[PDB]
Each structure stands twice: as C-alpha cells, then as structure tokens.
Design a protein around this ligand. Structure first.
Ligand SMILES: NC(=O)c1ccc[n+]([C@@H]2O[C@H](COP(=O)([O-])OP(=O)(O)OC[C@H]3O[C@@H](n4cnc5c(N)ncnc54)[C@H](OP(=O)(O)O)[C@@H]3O)[C@@H](O)[C@H]2O)c1
Ligand SMILES: O=C(O)CCc1ccc(-c2cccc([N+](=O)[O-])c2)s1
Length: 316
C-alpha cells in the first residue's frame, strides 16, 4: 500500500487524511498537531465546519516548527452552497485560505451540487423549512472553480456528493477546462457505492470516502440506526487480523483505491487510525464487507429533497 494516489492534475494525494467535521474548535488545534506529529499529511476541512481558523493554527505551528514542509501537506477545503454564484467563489476560497493561513489549497471541492441563496445563513429557509435555492447553474460554478486554478489559489478542484449524472454533466460541460480531480462521497460497508465509484475511477477521478466509521457523533443519530463500529461481523474480521474495528473500516476503502478521511479529536484514536499500513484484508474479507451494503446514509437532508440538484433521488 503506497501512501499517495496520483491525481489527474499530476499531483499526489495522501490516501489517509484527518477529518474535521464536528471537531470542536477548542480541541481541533491539538488534534491536527497530534495528527501531523504521528504522520498525517492530509487534512479535510470546510468553511461550513466553522473551525478552519483553529485547524490553521495547528498547520501554521507545524510549518513554523519545521515538523513538515508545506509541499508535504495536502490541505483540502470546500465551497459552501451559499457561495455557488460565480462572483462569490473567489472570496469564499480566499476566506478559507486566510483562516487556514495558507497561500494555496491542494484541493478545493464544491461541497454539494445544490446551490442556495447567498446570505449569512448557511441554510436559508422559506417559512416551511425548504431550503431556498440559487438559480446559478452548477456548470457556471465549475467555471468559477477553474478560475481559482488559473489564479494560483488552488492546485486542484473537485466535487463532493455528486451523483453519476452530475459527474457526467461536469465531464460533458461545453468548454470544460479542468476535469474534477476528486469526488468526495459517503462510503462505508453500509453504503458501498460500487456503481458511482467504478464510474468515477473509469474517468480518472479519484474517490474520497467520508464517514468511513459511520459517523457515530453525527447530530441526528438514533438508537435504531445500524452501527458499523458495533457490528459483530466487522468486529470478527478485526479480531482475526489483531486490529480494531475502526482500523478495518479505514483499511477497507484503502484497498478499493479510495482516499479515506476518518475524523477524531482523541489523540489515541488519531494515532490508531493511522496504523493501517501494516496489514491486509483478503479478497474474501473485502467481498464480505461489501456484502453489508444497505444504502444507508449519514448525510442526506430533508430540507433539500426538493432542490432540483438534490443528489440522492438517482440510483447512483
Ligand atoms: N463532503 C461532505 O459532505 C462530508 C460529509 C461528512 C463528512 N465529511 C468529512 O469526512 C470526515 C469523516 O466523517 P465523519 O466525521 O462524519 O465520521 P467518521 O470519521 O466516520 O467518524 C467520526 C467519529 O468516530 C469516532 N472515532 C474516530 N476514531 C475512532 C476509533 N479509532 N475508534 C472509535 N471511535 C472513533 C470519533 O470520535 P472522537 O472524535 O471523539 O475521537 C467520531 O465520533 C468528516 O470529519 C469530514 O472531514 C465530508
Ligand atoms: O457539511 C458536511 O460535510 C457534513 C454535514 C452535512 C450533512 C448533510 C448536508 C447537506 C448539505 C447540502 C445539501 C444536502 N442534501 O442535498 O442532502 C445535504 S451537509
């Protein structure tokens, strides 16, 4: 297992990164510092997480301390829905750069295919709780992303939560200048994504798997939900390999040629989650884990299900 994967922009991306959604701002600086100390070279960020300043403090300290060189880091962020208007994209990117204390991002993603009305609120609502859409075509948002590459603000651009038809729409964009480098999507044994993954990979788009542990700290968890970390079938595979269940859940996407971004603010878990380059799952293990698919999603919002670009009506 090599540590990086080659992107279609010619750059190499570390296959293991640290997630930061829900990482408390008064814990995430230490989390990122520890992560870098124990080997992480890829951090997954977003403006909507409201903690980029604090992530940036950690990155900057480790750069200043000469623990790692900037060229060795791979920092990812995402354009939030309320900034899909072409005239807002640069400012959104620059705010993220300022907070992260960087002069470029390695990868900048359209966070969701759904554009929302611009304003202070991240989810602008009408009086019934439907999100208020923007009419900016995603192809136009893509053109604005391409400009960021041409201005030196980002080395690569990509997409997140795009379904197969939406990926195809970008790939078929009239006058397309840069293909997406990455599609970042939810992926784990309960949402295995075979069709979408094969399609993206076939087009040279690298897939990043989010919520690989099933996001046990997600705000809307319910007792009746399935639980990857507690599934005795997965625990059994872990026990056989003398690894933790989390380690199996992280190794799984790695062996599908995916990038994976487990989140933790717990130092011992941050280290545990990185110790996944010293064992292999068999083909039988892989097929067994794939068999647990049930199309179960951590991330899908009722408020967006009527948006014309809602991604999860389509089979994939
Ligand atoms: N593009 C998108 O729309 C999108 C959507 C969702 C997520 N993401 C990205 O993907 C990242 C990962 O997804 P996620 O945050 O939803 O959930 P996740 O990585 O699947 O799971 C995070 C949860 O697992 C716990 N955990 C971590 N390591 C563990 C271990 N070794 N043993 C037991 N528990 C462990 C964490 O607890 P502690 O932190 O307390 O240690 C936390 O409660 C996000 O942080 C974000 O960067 C992107
Ligand atoms: O922000 C993160 O990375 C994780 C937190 C989220 C969970 C669901 C989100 C969402 C945003 C826009 C649209 C839709 N939609 O169409 O279903 C969903 S964001």
């Amino acid at each position: 297992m090599a540590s990086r994967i080659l992107l279609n922009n010619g750059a190499k991306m570390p296959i293991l990164g640290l997630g930061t959604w829900k990482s408390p701002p008064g814990q995430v600086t230490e989390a990122v510092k520890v992560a870098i100390d124990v080997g992480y070279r890829h951090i997954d960020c977003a403006h909507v997480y409201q903690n980029e300043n604090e992530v940036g403090v950690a990155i900057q300290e480790k750069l200043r301390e000469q623990v790692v060189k900037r060229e060795e880091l791979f920092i990812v962020s995402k354009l939030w829905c309320t900034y899909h208007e072409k005239g807002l994209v640069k400012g959104a990117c620059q705010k993220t750069l300022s907070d992260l204390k960087l002069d470029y991002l390695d990868l900048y993603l359209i966070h969701w295919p759904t554009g929302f009305k611009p304003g202070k609120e991240f989810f602008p609502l009408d009086e019934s709780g439907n999100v208020v859409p923007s009419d900016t075509n995603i192809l136009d948002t893509w053109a604005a992303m391409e400009e960021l590459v041409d201005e030196g603000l980002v080395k690569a651009i990509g997409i997140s939560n795009f379904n197969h038809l939406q990926v195809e729409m970008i790939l078929n964009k009239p006058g397309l200048k840069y293909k997406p480098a990455v599609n970042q999507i939810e992926c784990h044994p309960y949402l295995t994504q075979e069709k979408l993954i094969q399609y993206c990979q076939s087009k040279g788009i690298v897939v990043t798997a989010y919520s690989p542990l099933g996001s046990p700290d997600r705000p809307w968890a319910k007792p009746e939900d399935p639980s990857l970390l507690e599934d005795p079938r997965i625990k059994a595979i872990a026990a056989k390999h003398n690894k933790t269940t989390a380690q199996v859940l992280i190794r799984f996407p790695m062996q599908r040629n995916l990038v994976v971004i487990p989140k933790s603010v717990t130092p011992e878990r941050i280290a545990e989650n990185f110790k996944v380059f010293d064992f292999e799952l068999s083909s039988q293990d892989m097929t067994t884990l794939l068999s647990y698919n049930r199309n179960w999603r951590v991330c899908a919002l009722l408020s967006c299900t009527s948006h014309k670009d809602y991604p999860f009506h389509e089979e994939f």
